[PDB]
Amino acid sequence: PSQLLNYIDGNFVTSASSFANINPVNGKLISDVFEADAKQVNEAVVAAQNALKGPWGKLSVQDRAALIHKIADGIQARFEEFVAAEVADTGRPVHQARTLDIPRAIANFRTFADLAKTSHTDLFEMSTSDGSGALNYTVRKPLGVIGVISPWALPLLLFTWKVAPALACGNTVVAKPSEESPSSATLLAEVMHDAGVPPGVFNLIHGFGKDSAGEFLTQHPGISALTFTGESKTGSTIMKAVADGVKEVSFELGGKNAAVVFADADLDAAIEGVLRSSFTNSGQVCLCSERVYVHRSIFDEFVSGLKVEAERLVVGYPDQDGVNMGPLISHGHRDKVLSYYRLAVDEGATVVTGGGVPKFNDERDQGAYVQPTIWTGLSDKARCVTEEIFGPVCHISPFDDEDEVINRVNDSNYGLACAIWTTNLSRAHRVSRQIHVGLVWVNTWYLRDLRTPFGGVKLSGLGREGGRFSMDFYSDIANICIKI
Amino acid sequence: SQLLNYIDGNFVTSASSFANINPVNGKLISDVFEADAKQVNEAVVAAQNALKGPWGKLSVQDRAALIHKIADGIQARFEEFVAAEVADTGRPVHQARTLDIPRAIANFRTFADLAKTSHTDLFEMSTSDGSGALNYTVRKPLGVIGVISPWALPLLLFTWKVAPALACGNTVVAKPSEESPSSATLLAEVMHDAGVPPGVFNLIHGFGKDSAGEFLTQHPGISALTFTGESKTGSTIMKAVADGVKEVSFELGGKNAAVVFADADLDAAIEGVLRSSFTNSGQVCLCSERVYVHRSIFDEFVSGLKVEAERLVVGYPDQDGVNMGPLISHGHRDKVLSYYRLAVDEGATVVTGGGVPKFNDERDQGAYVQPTIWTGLSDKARCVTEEIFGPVCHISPFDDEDEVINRVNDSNYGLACAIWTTNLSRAHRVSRQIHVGLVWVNTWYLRDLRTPFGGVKLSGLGREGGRFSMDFYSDIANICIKI
Amino acid sequence: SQLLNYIDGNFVTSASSFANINPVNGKLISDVFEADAKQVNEAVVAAQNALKGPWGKLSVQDRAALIHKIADGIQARFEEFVAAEVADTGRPVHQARTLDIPRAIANFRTFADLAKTSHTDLFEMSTSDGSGALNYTVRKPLGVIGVISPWALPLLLFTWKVAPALACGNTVVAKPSEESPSSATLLAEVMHDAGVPPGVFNLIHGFGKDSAGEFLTQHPGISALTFTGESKTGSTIMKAVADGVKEVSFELGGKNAAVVFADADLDAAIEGVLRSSFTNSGQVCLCSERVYVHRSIFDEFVSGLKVEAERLVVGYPDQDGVNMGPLISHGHRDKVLSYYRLAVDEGATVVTGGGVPKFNDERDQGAYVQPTIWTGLSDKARCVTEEIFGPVCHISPFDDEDEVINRVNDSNYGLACAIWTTNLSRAHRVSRQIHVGLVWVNTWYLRDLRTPFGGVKLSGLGREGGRFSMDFYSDIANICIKI
Amino acid sequence: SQLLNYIDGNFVTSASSFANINPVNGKLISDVFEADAKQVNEAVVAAQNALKGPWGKLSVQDRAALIHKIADGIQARFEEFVAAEVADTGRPVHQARTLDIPRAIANFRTFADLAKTSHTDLFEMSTSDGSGALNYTVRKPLGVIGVISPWALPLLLFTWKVAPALACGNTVVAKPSEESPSSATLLAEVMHDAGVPPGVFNLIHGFGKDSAGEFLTQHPGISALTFTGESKTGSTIMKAVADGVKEVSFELGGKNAAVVFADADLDAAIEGVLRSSFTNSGQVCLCSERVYVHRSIFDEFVSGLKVEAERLVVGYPDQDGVNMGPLISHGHRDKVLSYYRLAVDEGATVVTGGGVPKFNDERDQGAYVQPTIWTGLSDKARCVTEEIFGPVCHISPFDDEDEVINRVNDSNYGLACAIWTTNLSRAHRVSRQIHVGLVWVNTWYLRDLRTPFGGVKLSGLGREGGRFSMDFYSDIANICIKI
Ligand SMILES: NC(=O)c1ccc[n+]([C@@H]2O[C@H](COP(=O)([O-])OP(=O)(O)OC[C@H]3O[C@@H](n4cnc5c(N)ncnc54)[C@H](O)[C@@H]3O)[C@@H](O)[C@H]2O)c1
Ligand SMILES: NC(=O)c1ccc[n+]([C@@H]2O[C@H](COP(=O)([O-])OP(=O)(O)OC[C@H]3O[C@@H](n4cnc5c(N)ncnc54)[C@H](O)[C@@H]3O)[C@@H](O)[C@H]2O)c1
Ligand SMILES: O=C/C=C/C=C(\O)C(=O)O
Ligand SMILES: O=C/C=C/C=C(\O)C(=O)O
Ligand code: NA
Ligand code: NA
Ligand code: NA
Ligand code: NA
């Protein structure tokens, strides 16, 4: 069918070997993707290094920002093509792609272009022993070549979340999208080319991780930084890989996030909110709630309500009427998720709903669908309650006391996000500050202001991105001290 | 003299002890107790528990007041700290009195003040339902901070990490260099006497591999590791903490250049390069071991620096008009001399020094070397590309501005650079093109503690100082309220 | 018993003096020397000259250190300051010990700390020739700051202006209220003893119109006039400095509302509104003279507040259990009692108070009034729209959230508002809709000195506090270097 | 043509009208309708109401998008705006195409962008009960912004105020100079076509006293008055708004100095001072009317500048290589020529110029004057101390750096200064000592829109630009939540 090429030094190029891109809706082949080899990865990095010395390196911040807005214009001009690409790779509902995924990719470019135009640095005056003084001023310069490695959860959103600030800060880029979701990134390369982005500034390499393009990229001494979103264990691997070169790193690594529903929550809103936080993108978001804590006084009503709403969810085709959930990303990921579904039963869970695979009795049975699933009855120490599944699942447990639930939320090796439901003013601020995570939402979930710091604690990450945090990470911060 | 660990509010010995040796005369100063894995665990657990005790309940203002009390404690025992630092390292008493100890005090006071005045951000946004949302950020303590520090500027560097760590409400497990354990031990006494709650500040003594340093980096209970020292050690530590994805902050030395343009105040530049090459006997990460001087003033510059270099007094720390003490250790002298010989083998001209002075007293059992200047090596020579960390510099002529910028940047390191020029445009044009974290113009190692400090390439990861320290030593959390 | 001016490093008398009267008993406390136009000129010229003296050459660190010594000086004479504030105003000794004097000290320390830690901005831009330019900003002293303060919280308000003025390196000519001259005079002594150079801080006593206050505002040698007091006086001062285009900053009182929603913690709201209505006998610009209570809890709220108001002990500043002292002066009492009468004529129900207590002792020669609560007036009544500045509130029921927001905002003033609610969305939704400079939720007059402070409409111009004071009391200069 | 008011979404005429006259040739360009007091009231009331309409409901993002569409609209009619600016003022077409119109576009885009990216502050504090509090600040629209602008840079200065006003969500009543009403009227058309809701932007035409300008300043319905123009007028306006305590922001011109040090690039400095003295025929608030040149290069500088001034082409706005058009009006020429005479009477040597060119065509009916250079005047001469606002400069020698700093600062004005020097230290040392809001080194009027812009002394009150505009055109509110 279609073919997805690498984009290296201003040219789309094939490779000696290719791999299949499979549609998870029906198991069908979508495209062949050309896997970049070590030589092609080197060529990309070298091209990126050289482009720093070319026209790109000479652009004013204003001209750079203008070109980045042109990249965003180019995505907007091919909006439905990008929607189609993202949907084909992942099975996500078309409505989700049209409202979350593709708009956020456009917004990523525009916001960081704007931040680049408006951001400034610092001036520090000091006295000296001779009485004449000195001036210290800081500047932001490009860090150099940014290696970007992104996952399949929100392919274009996460890819552009890294590529946008990288380019806004005047860096050049070598970027490796997930082998599961290569299409929109390839379309993005086309937009870059058509927008007139100079050769070598943006390079797209396809492939896998170990023994493939991903590993080749992290090991290349020519990069200045590696920014990554994906599995915690992969973060550790990458951190070791770049250590000999002391490369700058930025990791967002998923979690085992909790939602907490206090007795004073708006109960219908909380049920809807937890439905969203547990089952959005079929549970395949690092920010999803796989643990839910509900006050004992409302526990039964909450569980019954969520069961009903989960069973109301339409699981099916991306453009099907009223669809809420598509499949998992791949048969391989479904294997992991189903193994946890089995483990929960073995650990003594009550399966409130789901727990298996829907039977469609059509081509979708060859796809990688699972049921939205709710568990109760597990202890806080069960594997299914402590390890990240990354499926459309949550376990629900009662609690009695505010300090109790705070400690239970924090009793985790992860620390990415938490969502709290309460109508009480003091409770909202008092509890949120005590949760050991990078991101707290109160009475909502995954509401994003791109200027805010975003990241996690513990195994969930290293560093922050977003707003000034990205402007700092993707820049060399240099202090220049002038003796007067 | 005995130096004990300080764990959970108590001074404790260990099963193993090692020698602390004065580098001036090779004499024994103290027995130092080496923390084992069990004690390192005891320290981290104590620090974890201290976050949940009285320390964790202090307001930012009360926390800052207590930190100013630590600073008062150092000031009150000022000469004791001076003598501890001098005994360990052989540094001139005058340097200890003007740089090392006052900076330690200033580190605590500055970060205490930054903590009092610092604030975070508020972002407003609109939502679909027309009600809006607000996102605000807060800085919280990161948790337990692991601190591993080197011997170059013992108390200064130790407190450069410990002060912001405490100011941000963290607890600390700190391991000073086995070569300079004394002032950190006296700090533990000041902390105790100021009434810092047990577990908040813990001091562990020992080495790196198979010792307290390694055990600290491997401990799952810490939240960050901040480190200053050798680049290869940074790499090792970065691998060590990777499985726990710990926050890291590294300053890793370098091979720094000074550049003297033809329009420099020549006398000021000679004096400045003498300072940047030979301060603390050249044992500062920021020292200029490479110097580039415009061809038109090269001979005059080299001659002038030779004269000044040979006027330097190498002797006892309290000796009249002393300029230089010994190197930190005989082991370090072995490294440095090995480089002295390598320079000759590489075809260098030895403008001055190149050996060790002869004292005919106890100092001959110490670890002294001479201030040394080389010329005549190529840019690819090992002696011009590898960090020596001794009182040495190589001087090379250059002709063009773009040329020297490229030669300065042609390095796997990238910590600092000092530029000498009287020209306005040149200062700003050139400074911005040097690939380092820190540039000084017409000075060297002039420090405003609010500024970002750190390196690029093999010279580091991250920035500390001012708000960069307030961010690194804090959990930054975003709280989003849907209205 | 005699209060002198402090001009160019010397305490000086004047040709005329006026009486300082104790409002507890109407007795004479001291005679105060009134600065004439000639002495006001002498003060401004000395302040101009001090800018060129040792004060001008101090580093920001040395300046901050000295300001901390001023604070130390107040702390060393803490009880004398308490006695001074209490004598002039009749405020309870407990209030003076807990609010007034500690805030004056905190004012100096906080702005000293901000001076030490604050920095400015660097902007890079590209140019036609490809070489670029740098713009950087600096904060410099504005010059001579004229400070005019009121009698409400005499030392607190005086130092609220003097502390940032001095922290930013200005020199100062300051005129405290004729009603409360004592603590400002003691402050002059602290400055003197602290070694603040002559001319840096000058104290001038007197009245407003046709006296020291007027003369100061009309002097061409000042660089700014900061003022807290009556709104119409703000307008007068704004016209007075206009020909010189002087920088101005005004906080001008108001007619503040407290709002108690049906979901409020009722007991907390009652105690809260007791504080916000009767603190300092209702003589604070931030006091709530209008109160809106949801009709479901209206009767219960008014009953509870009546009981608590009637439990207030009104009396001597050192009286066991005293809660309220007198009004500042007989003349101010005349105004307040005029409003007490007007309220009755306007149809008010007097829930409690409404007159003067009968003590049958020397307090009857003082300026006491009763804490007072009204109900039953229209939103357009004079007693509900005009600032009384006494220990009084009118309470009105309301039904709807949008209704009460509009009623709060229906005012020519806009200083502060206190809102009582336990609902998360309501707190943030309502607070952002109130047209004032300052909103408190579930509290009142809780002050973080870093925050912007000021009013809208007739309640002010500009903001002070934190960075806003650092900006106002500074020349902000932009320096652009073409490279 | 005919230029109408734009009020509540409609173009409207008036009872009275006045002439718009081309200063190149004295010909009538348009009739302009003068808004009366009734119409000013209608505009302010329309602005107040528009705050409660769809404008007030827009998200910051949607508001910024709309402002970007305003900018798009000006760009889409770029040459129409150019022709309008040129017709009114006689400015060179090249200047209008490179400075005036592009800056108007950039004004809207920059403040739209700043609105999108700017945020506010979060401060945490501890309280007695140990539960804590949080203070967060928000930026809200101030309300109705009155804008009064002058004829020096008509659309640039008009949009410099209107853009941040709209970006901060205010509504606007704006009064452009009677001398240059065209581009503002075109801007009203752009707003209308972009779909800016009725009442959000209102344009009123007329004069000052007893006309639209005065009526606007006296209207109690405005929330602020921002103004650029003559110092005396700023003073008058400051008095006019005083009774309402309206927020004010003033930039008020000056008597700016250029300084040329002996180490300057002399050719660059000659070119630089040519630009700073004669750009827009010297009709910019920032122009250098005083020049100080080191004695050692004084003669060479003056001869060089004389030659370059005499090569300036004075003539038609679209003439081949024109450098200078006429002055704004015959009335302004009367003022400027009166100063030309006065300089001679004060004993000046007329190095070049001093009269009016003879064209022998329609330009003789215009308002042209010659670029003029004087020498030989005292620092106290009227022509050296009073703003002329024509294409003139006086040049005086100096000997010492501290001397020249004092001479530059010896002025009742303090807007800007340009300094020429190749020395690094001198650039930073001297710039910091000049008592003005704006310093340029080795350039002049190089603008980064994010930087603070304003003057000291009689040259202004407040700063605008970047965050300073975001603060001025907003209500800053502090919301304190007790937890
Ligand atoms: N950046 C600097 O300021 C700095 C300071 C001193 C030395 N150095 C460089 O390194 C050389 C010094 O030798 P060194 O052994 O003292 O440097 P080092 O970097 O190995 O030692 C620094 C600190 O880290 C500890 N450490 C060493 N190995 C460790 C490990 N595997 N895990 C945890 N901690 C470990 C040490 O005990 C010591 O406290 C010098 O020649 C110089 O080039 C740099
Ligand atoms: N905002 C506040 O904190 C505050 C404080 C005190 C009083 N007030 C209000 O004002 C009334 C008090 O009367 P007041 O006379 O004491 O207030 P005032 O505003 O007239 O006096 C305040 C200060 O300004 C000075 N002053 C007065 N007129 C002046 C003038 N024309 N030029 C220069 N300085 C002048 C005074 O001497 C005093 O130091 C109260 O009833 C109350 O409503 C407000
Ligand atoms: O040996 C390296 C020196 C580091 C200096 C600092 O960290 C400092 O001065 O803050
Ligand atoms: O005539 C006065 C100059 C005004 C310039 C500006 O306000 C600007 O360039 O922003
Ligand atoms: Na796929
Ligand atoms: Na030692
Ligand atoms: Na009195
Ligand atoms: Na005209």
PDB file of N, CA and C in Angstrom, chain B residues 148-151 157 160-161 226-230 249-253 285 464:
ATOM      1  N   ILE B 148      27.814  14.632  46.746  1.00  0.00           N
ATOM      2  CA  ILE B 148      29.172  14.091  46.681  1.00  0.00           C
ATOM      3  C   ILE B 148      30.082  15.187  46.157  1.00  0.00           C
ATOM      4  N   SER B 149      31.091  15.564  46.939  1.00  0.00           N
ATOM      5  CA  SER B 149      31.865  16.751  46.610  1.00  0.00           C
ATOM      6  C   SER B 149      33.369  16.466  46.572  1.00  0.00           C
ATOM      7  N   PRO B 150      34.138  17.335  45.893  1.00  0.00           N
ATOM      8  CA  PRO B 150      35.559  17.046  45.673  1.00  0.00           C
ATOM      9  C   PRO B 150      36.462  17.847  46.595  1.00  0.00           C
ATOM     10  N   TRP B 151      37.768  17.760  46.356  1.00  0.00           N
ATOM     11  CA  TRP B 151      38.741  18.362  47.271  1.00  0.00           C
ATOM     12  C   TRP B 151      39.266  19.731  46.854  1.00  0.00           C
ATOM     13  N   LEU B 157      32.569  24.130  47.993  1.00  0.00           N
ATOM     14  CA  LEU B 157      31.800  23.244  47.118  1.00  0.00           C
ATOM     15  C   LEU B 157      30.795  22.387  47.878  1.00  0.00           C
ATOM     16  N   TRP B 160      28.048  24.676  48.734  1.00  0.00           N
ATOM     17  CA  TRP B 160      27.399  25.140  47.508  1.00  0.00           C
ATOM     18  C   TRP B 160      26.228  24.219  47.177  1.00  0.00           C
ATOM     19  N   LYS B 161      26.339  22.951  47.578  1.00  0.00           N
ATOM     20  CA  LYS B 161      25.273  21.969  47.382  1.00  0.00           C
ATOM     21  C   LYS B 161      24.359  21.891  48.610  1.00  0.00           C
ATOM     22  N   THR B 226      23.646  15.308  43.466  1.00  0.00           N
ATOM     23  CA  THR B 226      24.390  16.439  42.931  1.00  0.00           C
ATOM     24  C   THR B 226      25.891  16.236  43.178  1.00  0.00           C
ATOM     25  N   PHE B 227      26.695  16.488  42.147  1.00  0.00           N
ATOM     26  CA  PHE B 227      28.088  16.048  42.136  1.00  0.00           C
ATOM     27  C   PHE B 227      28.984  17.057  41.444  1.00  0.00           C
ATOM     28  N   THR B 228      30.164  17.283  42.008  1.00  0.00           N
ATOM     29  CA  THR B 228      31.185  18.067  41.337  1.00  0.00           C
ATOM     30  C   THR B 228      32.445  17.208  41.413  1.00  0.00           C
ATOM     31  N   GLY B 229      33.178  17.096  40.311  1.00  0.00           N
ATOM     32  CA  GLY B 229      34.393  16.290  40.291  1.00  0.00           C
ATOM     33  C   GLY B 229      34.807  15.929  38.877  1.00  0.00           C
ATOM     34  N   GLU B 230      35.399  14.748  38.710  1.00  0.00           N
ATOM     35  CA  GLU B 230      35.897  14.340  37.396  1.00  0.00           C
ATOM     36  C   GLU B 230      34.754  13.934  36.461  1.00  0.00           C
ATOM     37  N   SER B 249      22.654  16.523  38.824  1.00  0.00           N
ATOM     38  CA  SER B 249      23.225  17.831  38.546  1.00  0.00           C
ATOM     39  C   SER B 249      24.732  17.661  38.657  1.00  0.00           C
ATOM     40  N   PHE B 250      25.449  17.900  37.564  1.00  0.00           N
ATOM     41  CA  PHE B 250      26.882  17.606  37.508  1.00  0.00           C
ATOM     42  C   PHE B 250      27.701  18.810  37.051  1.00  0.00           C
ATOM     43  N   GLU B 251      28.792  19.095  37.762  1.00  0.00           N
ATOM     44  CA  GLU B 251      29.785  20.032  37.265  1.00  0.00           C
ATOM     45  C   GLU B 251      31.089  19.249  37.237  1.00  0.00           C
ATOM     46  N   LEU B 252      31.718  19.196  36.068  1.00  0.00           N
ATOM     47  CA  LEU B 252      32.678  18.140  35.774  1.00  0.00           C
ATOM     48  C   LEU B 252      34.031  18.638  35.255  1.00  0.00           C
ATOM     49  N   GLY B 253      34.383  19.871  35.599  1.00  0.00           N
ATOM     50  CA  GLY B 253      35.694  20.391  35.241  1.00  0.00           C
ATOM     51  C   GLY B 253      35.843  20.595  33.744  1.00  0.00           C
ATOM     52  N   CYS B 285      38.427  23.823  38.949  1.00  0.00           N
ATOM     53  CA  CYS B 285      37.853  23.337  37.700  1.00  0.00           C
ATOM     54  C   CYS B 285      37.843  24.442  36.651  1.00  0.00           C
ATOM     55  N   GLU B 464      23.289  25.204  38.314  1.00  0.00           N
ATOM     56  CA  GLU B 464      22.958  25.554  39.690  1.00  0.00           C
ATOM     57  C   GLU B 464      23.206  27.046  39.888  1.00  0.00           C
TER      58      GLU B 464
END
